[PDB]
Amino acid sequence: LVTPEDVMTISSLEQRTLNPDLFLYKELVKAHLGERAASVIGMLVALGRLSVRELVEKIDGMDVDSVKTTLVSLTQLRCVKYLQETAISGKKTTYYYYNEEGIHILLYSGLIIDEIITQMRVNDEEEHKQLVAEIVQNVISLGSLTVEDYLSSVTSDSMKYTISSLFVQLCEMGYLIQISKLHYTPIEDLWQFLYEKHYKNIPRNSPLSDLKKRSQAKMNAKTDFAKIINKPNELSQILTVDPKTSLRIVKPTVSLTINLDRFMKGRRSKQLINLAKTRVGSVTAQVYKIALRLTEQKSPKIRDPLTQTGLLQDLEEAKSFQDEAELVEEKTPGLTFNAIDLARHLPAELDLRGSLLSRKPHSASLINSHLKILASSNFPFLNETKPGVYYVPYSKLMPVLKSSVYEYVIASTLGPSAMRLSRCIRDNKLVSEKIINSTALMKEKDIRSTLASLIRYNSVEIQEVPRTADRSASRAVFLFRCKETHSYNFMRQNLEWNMANLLFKKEKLKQENSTLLKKANRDDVKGRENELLLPSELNQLKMVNERELNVFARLSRLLSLWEVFQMA
Amino acid sequence: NYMSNLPFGLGYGDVGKNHITEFPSIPLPINGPITNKERSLAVKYINFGKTVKDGPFYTGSMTNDGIERYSDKYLKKRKIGISIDDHPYNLNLFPNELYNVMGI
Amino acid sequence: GPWFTDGELDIEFINSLLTIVWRFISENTFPNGFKNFENGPKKNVFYAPNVKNYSTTQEILEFITAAQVANVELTPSNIRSLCEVLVYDDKLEKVTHDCYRVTLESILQMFSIFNYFKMFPASKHDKEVVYFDEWT
């Protein structure tokens, strides 16, 4: 037997109580910044919006100075937001928030650098790879940067063009935007500010009714919100300027940051390619690989247009968001494309020659065949506006991507019988056990065992039906549902918790084994630790580094797993 | 007698002993061997998380004796420090309250 | 349910129909039966969107009657019930008006959560291995 004392050390029952959001954010900021940043971030996440005096009163550290330093560091890493508001009765009190998108840069850093390296297509030139890697690394590690700072951070009398021509190339592909106050401002607070000043300048006792006034304010603030949101995302005027006898060079004064939205869209493109590779041929998916990369730059925003976070959803009129999503995703002129466009950007390696059998040189008639294959597939990979016109229906492809990833996680963890039963109950509606036996053809004992193993997660819901006034469990007949929202909700929290657990374990290992990293720093760890003898020390270093690499690999796989559930 | 009840699929031998493993048993397919791509990704992840910690924005900390001899003299200083004041800050991005701690 | 055994399923016989019904559809919906997916991933060759490559319920019924592994009578409702039972598990991607194809089960028989078939396990007594029931 294992005693309860041994349980608290080996098993992670101590960490099974911590909240997944607080655990993961706190671990990330503790890994990358430290204990004060973790304290402030934990307090913000646990309590919400706070002021500096409230932070001092809450955290044991009563040194305002320490709080101010922690807040400036957290703002430079844009892990926090601020809202400086003024009370009508007197003075003004600022307030602070925790930035979900700021921490996710630390959570995604290696993947971000990977994407920026691979998309510049600098695999030809070695120095280009090092240059873009250094640019993106320094930007992420510094929070925000300027071209002047980067150019003065290099030896003079050199070819500044070589280190600046790709910078504009970075800015032109959407992997770099300028930073403004909207990034540090809460979206719902901005929507509250914009909804007023349109419900206030209304004439007194106007002929328009109160409902009409509120609707008028809504659709007159939506336009301003859209303008302010779209301004920093896509306005290339900074890179459009051009000093005389020079190339296209960005404005020195503007300060640049990473554009998380573009990276998220790239991740969605990757997920779509990987899911497409499982329903058609590699040749067909090879074209899909370049079709998605062409529309990626102009693709719609992924997590939200920022308008669901901005307000109450509606009385019943999220249809006014669904319809606009369809309208954009189709009527975008860049998004619409034909079989002619795909010819030019087609890979040189691809042949397309014998991939097709009709009746059972990069020709445009070959592409149309595979695009018709994509449209014919059960998954709406592509849809046609007019014969010869093509577009990707995100509004209908994201639910199927989510459901497929979910059911395959179920298959890989629980039984294939569990996957079959989950799909059976989902396809059906409110199916009873006798009918489950009828349309699933599996023994009732096994069906019950798998159903129980499935209810431990939010995957199968029970719908009771009572036959007596007192809802006895003997006289009631029990049904089943699936409730896709609950199931996706549980799945993302589980993966978030497990990422938090892995990062915590890595930090614990480094804590225990820093006694060798001290000597490593003493003796120039890279390549020389063999010369310091201590073969036990070298072996311990080896296995701890192996554990670190494995931790990072499993973390990246967990990231790919929870990405689709993080979508909406 | 509270021991008379018994389900059909259960015998007296199976019941009467509460045993919940409390240790996990259903793994995830993400813990297989490593790949070269994931290896290089881990390397860059290691370079990150390290560069920032050795950088200026740390805020991490939450025999320096008083006796003076020649050992303290000409002693190699361990590090050249950095402060919040050094890094160039764009003043618009920061609220007015925090200007005091940064070097104006 | 003429396939009942003492009023219960047998699964073994039900699986016997399933292992053969699936094989024909793959022969039907691919240019070279199963041999197409044996030469190589890049030597793969697939149908053209215009040509019909699916199969109907009556064709499956007559094929399973000619093979006669069923040993009893099978109504079209019976063959449809079996097809619906196996239409889950991604088996037999349904096509319009009682038609079916096979898409990934080729690789199923032969990191992405999809191709987890080729995922070696932990096979160690080490830590950091991530489980699915650990948190709850």
Task: Give me the residue label for tokens 């938090």.
Answer: A500
The whole-angstrom separation of Cα A66 and Cα A64 is 5
Give every CB contact of residue B61 below 8 A, 6+ residues apart in sequence.
Answer: A34, A35, A36
CB A384 within 8 A of CB A419: no
- Helical pair A100-107 and A109-119, crossing angle rounded to 10 deg: 70
- The A residues from 69 to 88 touching B (CB cutoff 8 Å) are 69-73, 75-77, 82, 84
Contact of A450 with A417, CB cutoff 8 Å? yes
CA-based angle A490:A494:A496, to the nearest 5?
120
Three-class SS of C2-18: CCCECCECCCHHHHHHH
A264 CB-contact burial (10 Å; exposed 0-12 / middle 13-18 / buried 19+): buried
Q: Measuring CA to CA, which residue among A370, A353, A349, A369 is closest to residue A361?
A: A353
CA angle A508, A510, A512 (to 5 degrees): 70
Closest CA of chain C from A216, distance in Å: 46
User: Angle formed by the axes of helices A126-142 and A165-172, to 10°?
Assistant: 70
Q: List chains touching B (3+ CB pairs under 8 A).
A: A, C
Whether the CB-CB separation of C68 and C81 falls below 8 Å is answered with no
Of A525, A66, A97, the residue nearest B58 (C-alpha): A66
Chain A: nearest CA to C67, how far in angstroms? 22
Amino acid at A214: R
- Residue A80 to residue A71: CA distance in whole angstroms: 8
Q: Could you give the maximum distance between any two Cα atoms of chain B, in Å?
A: 88
Query: Tokens 């005091």 appear where?
Result: B100
CB A343 within 8 Å of CB A364: yes
Residue of B nearest to A136 (CA): B48
Backbone angles phi, psi at A257, to 5 degrees: -140, 170
Break-preceding residues in chain A (C–N over 2.5 Å): 360
Whole-angstrom Cα distance, residue A145 to residue A129? Answer: 19
**Across-strand partners of A389?**
A338
Chain B positions touching C113 (Cβ under 8 A) are 29
CA–CA dist A326, A397 (Å, integer): 12
A81 within 8 A of A185, measured Cβ to Cβ: yes
**In terms of DSSP H, where are the helices of A182-338?**
187-195, 210-233, 237-240, 260-276, 282-294, 319-331
With the C-alpha atoms ordered C85, C90, C93, C97, is the resulting torsion angle positive or negative? positive
Provide the pairing of β-strand A356-357 with C46-47. Answer: parallel
Angle, CA of A386, A388 and A393, to the nearest 5°: 65
Question: What residue of A is the nearest CA neighbor of B84?
Answer: A69
Question: What is the Cα–Cα distance from C123 to A91, expressed in whole angstroms?
Answer: 64
Residue A7's CB is within 10 A of a number of other CB atoms, namely: 14
Q: What secondary structure letter does DSSP report for C35?
A: G
Question: How much helix, strand and coil, in percent to the nearest 5, is found in chain C?
Answer: 40, 10, 55
Q: Please give the residue of chain B at the shortest CA–CA distance from C134.
A: B24
Q: Which of the 8 DSSP states describes residue A50?
A: B
Say if the Cβ atoms of A34 and B52 lie within 8 Å: no
What's the rounded Cα separation, in Å, for the pair A447 and A453? 10
CA–CA gap between residue C88 and residue A442 (Å, rounded) = 13
CA distance, residue B26 to nearest chain C CA (Å)? 5
Which residues in chain C are closer than 8 Å to B28, comparing Cβ atoms?
130-132
Nearest 5°: CA angle at C126, between C121 and C131?
A: 55
Contacts of A537 (CB under 8 A, 6+ apart): A516, A519, A529
- d(CA C54, CA C26) in angstroms, rounded, equals 9
Can you say whether residue C98 is alpha, beta or left, with left for phi > 0 and alpha for psi between -120 and 50 degrees?
Answer: left
Cβ A336 vs Cβ A390: under 8 Å = yes
Determination approach: cryo-EM
Contacts of A345 (CB under 8 A, 6+ apart): A290, A294
Locate B83 and state its tokens. 């402060």
Angle, CA of C5, C10 and C15, to the nearest 5°: 140
Q: Secondary structure of A117-185 in the HEC alphabet? A: HHHCCCCCCHHHHHHHHHHHHHHHHHCCECHHHHHHCCCCCCCCCCCCHHHHHHHHCCCCEECCCCCCC
Q: What whole-number distance in Å separates Cα of residue A305 and Cα of residue A321?
A: 9
| Residue C97 per-residue DSSP state | T
Residues A283 and C43: their CA atoms lie apart, in Å, by 10
Do residues A516 and A540 touch, judged by C-beta distance below 8 A? yes
> Which residues partner with A464 through β-bridges?
A478
Closest partner residue to B31 among C113, C129, C133, by Cβ? C129
DSSP A492-528: HHHHHHHHHHHHHHHHHHHHHHHHHHHHHHHTTHHHH
Phi, psi of A99 (to 5 degrees): -90, 115
Chain B with chain C: Cβ pairs closer than 8 A: 35
Closest CA to A143 of A76, A69, A75, A81: A76
Instruction: Mark which residues 497-516 of A lie under 8 Å from B by CB.
Output: 498
CA distance linking residue A87 with residue A377, whole number of Å? 59
| Nearest residue to A74 (alpha-carbon basis) of B54, B52, B47, B62 | B52
Does residue A256 sit in helix, strand or coil? strand
Give the closest residue to A541 by CA, choosing from A506, A514, A523: A514
Q: Which helix (H) or strand (E) covers residue A478, if one does?
A: strand A477-481
Report how far residue A546's alpha carbon sits from residue B33's, in angstroms, rounded to the nearest whole number. 11
Break sites following residues in chain C (C–N > 2.5 A): 110
Residues present in chain C in total: 136
Within 13 Å and on the Cβ side, how many CA atoms surround A460?
30
Contacts of C114 in chain B (CB under 8 A): none
Which residue in chain C has the smallest CA separation from A15?
C135
- The owner of tokens 């022969």 is C27
DSSP state of B64: -
Backbone phi, then psi, for A200, in 5-degree steps?
A: -105, -40
The alpha carbons of chain A give a radius of gyration, in whole angstroms, of: 28
Residues of B in contact with A68 (CB under 8 A): 97-98, 100-101
Q: Cβ-count burial of A229 within 10 angstroms (0-12 exposed, 13-18 middle, 19+ buried)?
A: middle
What is the spatial distance between Cα A99 and Cα A80, in angstroms, rounded to a whole number? 5
8-state DSSP, A82: E
Partner-chain contact C130 B30, CB within 8 Å: yes
Q: Which residues on chain B are in Cβ contact (under 8 Å) with A549?
A: 34, 39, 42
| DSSP designation for A57 | H
C130–B31 CB contact, under 8 Å: yes
Give me B79's structure tokens: 């590090």
Show the tokens assigned to A85: 């508001």
Q: Structure tokens of A54?
A: 């409230």
Q: Report the half-sphere exposure of A309 (CA within 13 A, side-chain side).
A: 13
Rounded Cα distance between A70 and C20, Å, is: 67
Compute the distance between CA of residue C64 and CA of residue C20 in angstroms, rounded to an integer.
9
CB contact under 8 A, B94 and A75: yes
Half-sphere exposure of B6 (CA within 13 A, CB side): 12
Whether C119 and chain B come into contact, CB under 8 Å, resolves to yes
Question: Helices in A33-125 by DSSP H: which ranges?
Answer: 35-47, 52-58, 64-76, 100-107, 109-119
Angle value at C-alpha A215, between A213 and A221, nearest 5 degrees: 100
The residue written with tokens 């598990």 in the block is C89
Three-state SS string over A378-398 comes to CCCCCECCCCCEEECCHHHHH
With tokens 């009023």, the residue in question is C7
Q: Which of residues 236-265 of A touch B (CB under 8 A)?
A: 255
Residues A527, C31: Cα–Cα separation, whole Å: 55
d(CA A134, CA B51): 12
The CA R_g of chain C, rounded to the nearest whole Å, is 19
Contacts C133 to B, Cβ<8 Å? 24-26
Nearest chain A CA: its distance from B6 CA (Å): 15
A544 part of contact set with chain C, CB < 8 Å: no
Which residue from A487, A485, A540 is spatially nearest to A516, judged by alpha carbons? Answer: A540
Chain centroid to CA A17: 25
Which of chain A's residues have a Cβ under 8 Å away from the Cβ of B96? 84
A375 neighbors A383 (Cβ within 8 angstroms):
yes
Smallest Cβ distance to B60: which of A35, A82, A106?
Answer: A35
Torsional sign, CA A167, A170, A175, A177: positive
Closest CA to C107 of A418, A409, A278, B30: A278
Going from the C-alpha of A415 to that of each of A451, A499, B26, the distances in angstroms are 11, 24, 11
C-alpha span between A379 and A276 (Å, rounded): 8
Distances (CA, A) of A321 to A186, A261, A325: 21, 19, 6
Residues of A in contact with B97 (CB under 8 A): 52, 68, 94
C 26-85 near B (Cβ less than 8 A)? none
Instruction: Identify the closest residue of chain A to C33 by CA–CA distance.
Output: A360
DSSP label at residue B83: -
Alpha helices in B1-104 (DSSP H): 36-47
CA distance A568 to C3: 45
Strand partners, A338: A389
Element housing A357 (H / E):
strand A356-357
One-letter identity of residue A40: V
CA atoms within 13 A on the CB side of C26: 20
Question: Whole-angstrom Cα distance, residue A396 to residue C17?
Answer: 35
Task: Kindly report the length of chain A.
Answer: 568
Contact check, Cβ <8 Å, B62/A61: yes
CB atoms within 10 A of CB C96: 6
Q: A456 at the C interface (CB within 8 A)?
A: yes
What is the Cα–Cα distance from B45 to C74, expressed in whole angstroms? 60
Q: Which residues contact A60 (CB under 8 A, 6 or more apart)?
A: none
Residue A373 contacts C where some CB pair is shorter than 8 Å: yes
E strand or H helix that includes residue A551: helix A535-566
Report the SS3 class of residue A372: helix
The answer to whether C114 contacts A408, with C-beta atoms less than 8 Å apart, is: yes
Angle (nearest 5°) at CA A436 between A434 and A440? 130
Quoted resolution (Å): 3.1
Rg (CA), chain B: 31
Check if A420 contacts C (Cβ < 8 Å): yes
Q: Is the dihedral of CA A117, A119, A124, A127 positive or negative?
A: negative
By the 8 A CB rule, do A476 and A464 touch? yes
Residues A172 and A465: their CA atoms lie apart, in Å, by 60
Q: Which residue has the tokens 């595979």?
A: A370
Contact A49, A524 (CB under 8 A): no
Report chain C's terminal Cα–Cα distance, integer Å. Answer: 40
**Residue C130: its chain A contacts at CB < 8 A?**
498, 501-502, 554, 558
* DSSP SS3 for A425: helix
Tell me which of B57, B58, B86 to substitute to probe the interface with A (most A C-beta atoms closer than 10 Å): B57
The tokens describing A261, both together, are 């939205």
Inter-residue contact A329 to A335 (CB < 8 Å): yes
In 3D space, the residue among A155, A88, A15, A72 whose CA is nearest the CA of residue A508 turns out to be A15
| Beta bridge pairs of residue A365 | none
Full 3-state SS string of A433-451: HHHHHHHHCCCHHHHHHHH
Sequence-ordered list of residues with C-beta below 8 angstroms from that of B32, at least 6 positions apart, any chain = C111, C119, C120, C121, C122
Closest partner residue to C113 among A283, A414, A561, by Cβ?
A561
Which spans in A277-340 are helix H?
Answer: 282-294, 319-331
Residue A288 token pair: 């899909």
Q: What is the rounded (10 degree) CA torsion for A86, A87, A91, A97? A: -50
Q: What are the b/e assignments for A400-425, b being 16+ CB within 10 Å?
A: ebbbbbbbbbbbbbbeebbbbbbbbb
CA nearest to B23 within chain C: C134
Long-range pairs of A200-209 with CB within 8 A, sequence gap ≥ 24:
none
